[PDB]
């Protein structure tokens, strides 16, 4: 497991796509990392296929698709204003 933090661009976006959830019965995986985005250019670097376990320190094993999606955009869970992600490549 490798931890990855980052911050959104001026439009508050990050530049990666997700899929899965409790509703899709799929683990939550990175679907694509657009180049040039923050998520493309962080160290350690996000990549397609990493499985996410936590977001800002929250176990999402039993959460849905729209629910997770709301978790990321909640720009207030971010300490120092960076979005913390824990993934399992």
């Amino acid at each position: 497991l490798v931890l990855i933090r980052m911050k959104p661009d001026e439009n508050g976006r990050f530049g990666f796509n997700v899929k899965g959830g409790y509703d899709q019965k799929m683990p939550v995986i990175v679907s694509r990392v657009a180049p040039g985005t923050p998520a493309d250019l962080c160290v350690p670097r996000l990549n397609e296929g990493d499985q996410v376990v936590l977001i800002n320190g929250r176990d999402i094993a039993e959460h849905t698709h729209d629910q997770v999606v709301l978790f990321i955009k909640a720009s207030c869970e971010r300490h120092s204003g960076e979005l913390m992600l824990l993934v399992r490549p």
Binding site: F14, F16, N17, K19, Q24, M26, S31, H65, V69, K73
Partner: peptide, 7 residues
């Protein structure tokens, strides 16, 4: 099909 969302 199965929904994927962009962030």
């Amino acid at each position: 099909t199965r929904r994927e969302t962009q962030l």
